[PDB]
Amino acid sequence: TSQVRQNYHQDSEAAINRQINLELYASYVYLSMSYYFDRDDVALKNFAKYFLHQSHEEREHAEKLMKLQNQRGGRIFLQDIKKPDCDDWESGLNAMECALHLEKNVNQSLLELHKLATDKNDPHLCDFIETHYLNAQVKAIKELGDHVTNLRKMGAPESGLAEYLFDKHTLG
Amino acid sequence: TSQVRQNYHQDSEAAINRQINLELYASYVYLSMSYYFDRDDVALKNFAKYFLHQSHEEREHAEKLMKLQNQRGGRIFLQDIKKPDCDDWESGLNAMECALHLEKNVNQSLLELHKLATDKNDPHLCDFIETHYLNAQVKAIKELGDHVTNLRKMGAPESGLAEYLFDKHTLG
Amino acid sequence: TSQVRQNYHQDSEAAINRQINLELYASYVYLSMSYYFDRDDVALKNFAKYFLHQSHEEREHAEKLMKLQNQRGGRIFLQDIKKPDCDDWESGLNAMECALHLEKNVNQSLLELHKLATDKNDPHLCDFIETHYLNAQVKAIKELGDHVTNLRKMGAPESGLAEYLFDKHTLG
Amino acid sequence: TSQVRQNYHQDSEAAINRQINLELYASYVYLSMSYYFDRDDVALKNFAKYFLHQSHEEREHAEKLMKLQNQRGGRIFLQDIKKPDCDDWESGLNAMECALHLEKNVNQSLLELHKLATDKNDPHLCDFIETHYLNAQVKAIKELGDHVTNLRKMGAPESGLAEYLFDKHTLG
Ligand SMILES: [Mg+2]
Ligand SMILES: [Mg+2]
Ligand SMILES: [Mg+2]
Ligand SMILES: [Mg+2]
Ligand SMILES: [Mg+2]
Ligand SMILES: [Mg+2]
Ligand SMILES: [Mg+2]
Ligand SMILES: [Mg+2]
Ligand SMILES: [Mg+2]
Ligand SMILES: [Mg+2]
Ligand SMILES: [Mg+2]
Ligand SMILES: [Mg+2]
Ligand SMILES: [Mg+2]
Ligand SMILES: [Mg+2]
Ligand SMILES: [Mg+2]
Ligand SMILES: [Mg+2]
Ligand SMILES: [Mg+2]
Ligand SMILES: [Mg+2]
Ligand SMILES: [Mg+2]
Ligand SMILES: [Mg+2]
Ligand SMILES: [Mg+2]
Ligand SMILES: [Mg+2]
Ligand SMILES: [Mg+2]
Ligand SMILES: [Mg+2]
Ligand SMILES: [Mg+2]
Ligand SMILES: [Mg+2]
Ligand SMILES: [Mg+2]
Ligand SMILES: [Mg+2]
Ligand SMILES: [Mg+2]
């Protein structure tokens, strides 16, 4: 048993490992989305940049959880990072909707993680989740919601013009 | 025979002269396209600027091949530069599609040139083509492909609005 | 078929997708190694920093291959990123030896990729591999070899002092 | 009763006074450790500096709790600050191990304090503990764990060389 470990339940340790995998998975989804918009037959460079940045952010979220695992004296256990559900993301709007769904899924995982930390009376872990993750998710979800709304109102995905102009004005 | 010449096949020499002509021809095509968009009844100033820059770049590509010819001890032999196939380029989209076709043609000529250089075991010439031309063509072809895609998705050439907005957002 | 595609064999396309997966896998291995040295019972902070940087570099290598795939008009197809072979990397020396083995494996994959590109007479792809990958691998392999040598000569892995001092002088 | 007091249980008030004493006690332990390494027959100047800084930090932690007591309308009640358990700390490693034990003890007191604040439904006090103390303890405990690990691996306390080099490379 680790010399630093204190008030850190084995269940929380495992949950943090699961969250690490989910963060890496989200990174992979955004990476895939990014390069979809880099295709010569899609060619929306700011969608590509937007999702690539989101991908790098998710890798940062994973790293911070790996740091936390070690901080508390838990042991990191990695699993395969699953390929994203889709190869062809269809359109700017569809990618945004998939991103919204991903972020809400990640948020639900974090809320379950927080419930466990609360159940195990781990206020350090509760504070960690709240501080670094919960509002970050709420902000990300609000942003994607805003984006989906604008694309829909502008006439996407039918209007190729709409996705083009959104790429320039919102993501540019 | 030139005091500098070494491992430079007469076939490669002739192929380099042919490539020089093709580069000058591409310069001429882009020059013609440029001023088409400068017409008062077309009036897309950023299309005009975009193609003029492309025209100057092609002249640079020709000059570098003339430099190479002399570097290797070959002798430059120039031919007439043919006028472009078209006087009226129709629309922004059509010009972009013609540019894409030109660049793919130039690329095929360069790949044939590379095949010959390989056949004649001329690694200096192979490296020259690879370094200065091959990725330049791949980048140019990708860019034009991206442009054609956006114009099509935006509704060109029917939508005069589409070509106008593309002129401002992508080429501006 | 892609409007930009030219001289790009389907076999090369698939090989590039396989290489993308391998680059992401290498990123994952280095990420795992990094946090191993961040454990309170290992606690070599410069080993951790060194491998984390290597991990980020591998993600850059993957992204550039995804860019290339689109540049040539191929289509990206992602697969699961396998977890690294090891959870516990044992020691600084052992991690370095595993890194050396990984880089030599990645190098062999790149040489096979180059052989295919040569077989299919794709000089753009040959140049791409040579320019961005081949010397990078040779440099990485030489560096890891140097590191393994120093750690061995210093008395690792038995000498805890040796790994400590190497962490400070070579990786610091 | 204080004009500012609101939702502040008498039990929490007393617990905060106990925590103030513990913070001052920790300050005293680190002060004693510091000057042990300043002895002419120990003479590790960076161990001395490291612990002196830790001592000043603990005094800051005590002051912030005294501030909090007044903020909430509680009344500060001070008790004797007990001398540290040891006069002679034996070695760099032993001092680090004693520091680790102290910080884990202080952490347990803070977790008990948080449990009480939770029991009394005092979210301001919960947030105060989480914000200013809980992660600070986790970080301190991780650091000391790392230090103990390195000293052990380097051969301390038998190796006088090990403590000397650690003093220079880690604490310098
Ligand atoms: Mg998992
Ligand atoms: Mg984000
Ligand atoms: Mg995340
Ligand atoms: Mg599957
Ligand atoms: Mg999806
Ligand atoms: Mg709370
Ligand atoms: Mg909080
Ligand atoms: Mg916050
Ligand atoms: Mg504007
Ligand atoms: Mg000719
Ligand atoms: Mg050009
Ligand atoms: Mg040219
Ligand atoms: Mg004629
Ligand atoms: Mg034409
Ligand atoms: Mg190059
Ligand atoms: Mg507009
Ligand atoms: Mg694969
Ligand atoms: Mg590297
Ligand atoms: Mg690599
Ligand atoms: Mg497996
Ligand atoms: Mg391995
Ligand atoms: Mg090079
Ligand atoms: Mg007391
Ligand atoms: Mg401290
Ligand atoms: Mg304290
Ligand atoms: Mg006493
Ligand atoms: Mg003690
Ligand atoms: Mg905090
Ligand atoms: Mg030194």
Curated annotation (Swiss-Prot), chains A, B, C, D:
Identify the residues that bind Fe cation 2: 58, 103, 137
Q: In which tissues is it expressed?
A: Expressed in the liver.
Result for mutant: residue 82 to Q: Reduces iron binding and oxidation rate. No effect on iron binding but the oxidation rate is severely reduced
Task: Give the GO molecular function terms.
Answer: ferric iron binding; ferrous iron binding; ferroxidase activity; identical protein binding; iron ion binding; iron ion sequestering activity
Compartments (UniProt record):
Cytoplasm; Lysosome; Cytoplasmic vesicle, Autophagosome
Q: Where does Fe cation 1 bind?
A: 23, 58, 61
Query: Per the record, where is site Essential for association with cargo receptor NCOA4?
Result: 18
Keyword annotations for this protein?
Acetylation, Cytoplasm, Cytoplasmic vesicle, Iron, Iron storage, Lysosome, Metal-binding, Neurodegeneration, Oxidoreductase, Phosphoprotein
The record's PROSITE patterns line, in alphabetical order, gives: FERRITIN_1 (PS00540), FERRITIN_2 (PS00204), FERRITIN_LIKE (PS50905)
Q: Does the keyword Acyltransferase apply?
A: no
Q: Which residues form the Ferritin-like diiron domain?
A: 6-155
For this UniProt entry, what is the primary localization, expressed as one broad class? Answer: cytoplasm
Q: Which reaction does it catalyse?
A: 4 Fe(2+) + O2 + 4 H(+) = 4 Fe(3+) + 2 H2O
Q: What is its EC number?
A: 1.16.3.1
What enzyme class is recorded for this protein?
A: oxidoreductase
The terms describing its cellular component in GO are: autolysosome; autophagosome; cytoplasm; cytosol; extracellular exosome; extracellular region; ferritin complex; ficolin-1-rich granule lumen
The record's listing under Pfam families reads: Ferritin
Q: Which GO terms describe its biological process?
A: immune response; intracellular iron ion homeostasis; iron ion transport; negative regulation of cell population proliferation; negative regulation of ferroptosis; negative regulation of fibroblast proliferation
Which function does this protein serve? Stores iron in a soluble, non-toxic, readily available form. Important for iron homeostasis. Has ferroxidase activity. Iron is taken up in the ferrous form and deposited as ferric hydroxides after oxidation. Also plays a role in delivery of iron to cells. Mediates iron uptake in capsule cells of the developing kidney. Delivery to lysosomes is mediated by the cargo receptor NCOA4 for autophagic degradation and release of iron.
Which medical condition is this protein associated with? Hemochromatosis 5: A disorder of iron metabolism characterized by iron overload. Excess iron is deposited in a variety of organs leading to their failure, and resulting in serious illnesses including cirrhosis, hepatomas, diabetes, cardiomyopathy, arthritis, and hypogonadotropic hypogonadism. Severe effects of the disease usually do not appear until after decades of progressive iron loading. Neurodegeneration with brain iron accumulation 9: An autosomal dominant neurodegenerative disorder associated with iron accumulation, primarily in the basal ganglia. It is characterized by global developmental delay apparent from infancy, and progressive decline of motor and cognitive skills. Clinical features include delayed walking or inability to walk, spasticity with hyperreflexia, ataxia, dystonia, and poor or absent language.
Assembly behavior? Oligomer of 24 subunits. There are two types of subunits: L (light) chain and H (heavy) chain. The major chain can be light or heavy, depending on the species and tissue type. In the human liver, the heavy chain is predominant. The functional molecule forms a roughly spherical shell with a diameter of 12 nm and contains a central cavity into which the insoluble mineral iron core is deposited. Interacts with NCOA4; NCOA4 promotes targeting of the iron-binding ferritin complex to autolysosomes following starvation or iron depletion.
According to its UniProt record, which protein family does this protein belong to? Belongs to the ferritin family.
Name it. Answer: Ferritin heavy chain
